[PDB]
Design a protein around this ligand. Structure first.
Ligand code: CL
Ligand code: CL
Ligand code: MG
Ligand code: MG
Ligand code: NA
Ligand code: NA
Length: 326
DNA sequence: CCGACGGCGCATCAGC
DNA sequence: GCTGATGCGCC
DNA sequence: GTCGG
């Protein structure tokens, strides 16, 4: 991590803009810059050197010069001292509490973990579970544990219907040694872009994982996306494992490649790739890649038989999952 | 200079 | 009840 | 905040 001090600064600025300022484009700008700097293979010597990178402009260059010179950023020193900003930044660390809710809570005098813990009745379902597992959700998952979780999910899904295919995506599929959570892409031949021949496809699977005490809580649930909590079983006399976040996304089987591209990420990689697509005259989502017609309206879905096909359309050399950790 | 910035699932709520 | 906006979440 | 037209 050659430029860890700089990327940390930019990430903190991004979080400020997202959580406090509520300026989503500034948030995205800062994260793009941190990402491009993170992959830069030299220790950065000045703002000008950084400004050569795409996504780093005049203002970030200036902040880099201050940070190189002094080891800190005055702007951030002040933000750190601001009680309201500090409170809002903290509250948003609870899953289900965003920029808006955090500011509203602070207005009501709810601004610490203790405050939250005595005001559960002021939380919606999602927020109440986020609070319940506040500490657990901040811990990362060792790949060894991700492997254990993979085995449970794949084996239980098979028990439900041998025709399901479950694929673990996210940072796991990018080969990370630790993951923030578990992301599972699910397919079944009864659910395609052309028909849904079986109901409760996602439900059946969730139910089974709850039955074996793997899924412990639900944050939200619809026909195609589950967002919840899970936990590895522990042995006799063993401390319990932390509770972990799990997302399950059922994708039309014939749209698996666009699905797995999306769910493999990273998020910044997806943003960069989708933006490049738009520049090349295509639009990409988790289902399809379509051309943009002269007007500006998406056209019909193009044939895709591999992840690589998607890269080809937009004239990118193929990038293995492990090289998409932007 | 200024329009655009990725795309979409689920929960909540206002207006009808 | 529905629909459209908004908040918050996924990558 | 940065980029491209
Ligand atoms: Cl700092
Ligand atoms: Cl589509
Ligand atoms: Mg993940
Ligand atoms: Mg996730
Ligand atoms: Na630049
Ligand atoms: Na949050």
């Amino acid at each position: 991590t050659l430029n860890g001090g700089i990327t940390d600064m930019l990430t903190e600025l991004a979080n400020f803009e997202k959580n406090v300022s509520q300026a989503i484009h500034k948030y995205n700008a800062y994260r793009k810059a941190a990402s491009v700097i993170a992959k830069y293979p030299h220790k950065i010597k000045s703002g000008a050197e950084a400004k050569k990178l795409p996504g780093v402009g005049t203002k970030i260059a200036e902040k880099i010069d201050e940070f190189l010179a002094t080891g800190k950023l005055r702007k951030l020193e002040k933000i750190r001292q601001d009680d309201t900003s500090s409170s809002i930044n903290f509250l948003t660390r609870v899953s289900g509490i965003g920029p808006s809710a955090a500011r509203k809570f602070v207005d009501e005098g709810i601004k610490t973990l203790e405050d939250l813990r005595k005001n559960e009745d002021k939380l919606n379902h999602h927020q109440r579970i986020g609070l319940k597992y506040f500490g657990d959700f901040e811990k990362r998952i060792p790949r060894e544990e991700m492997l254990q979780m993979q085995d449970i999910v794949l084996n239980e899904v098979k028990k439900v219907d041998s025709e399901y295919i479950a694929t673990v995506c996210g940072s796991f599929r990018r080969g990370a040694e630790s993951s923030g959570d578990m992301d599972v892409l699910l397919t079944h031949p009864s659910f395609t872009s052309e028909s849904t021949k079986q109901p409760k496809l996602l439900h059946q699977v969730v139910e089974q994982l709850q039955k074996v005490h793997f899924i412990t809580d639900t944050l939200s649930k619809g026909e195609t996306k589950f967002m919840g909590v899970c936990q590895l079983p522990s042995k006799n006399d063993e401390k319990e494992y932390p509770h972990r976040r799990i997302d399950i996304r059922l994708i039309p089987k014939d749209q698996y490649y666009c699905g797995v591209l999306y769910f493999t990420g990273s998020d910044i990689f997806n943003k960069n790739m989708r933006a490049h697509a738009l520049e090349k005259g295509f639009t990409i989502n988790e289902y399809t890649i379509r051309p943009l017609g002269v007007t500006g309206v998406a056209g019909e879905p193009l044939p895709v038989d591999s992840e690589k096909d998607i890269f080809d359309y937009i004239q990118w050399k193929y990038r293995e999952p492990k090289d998409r950790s932007e």
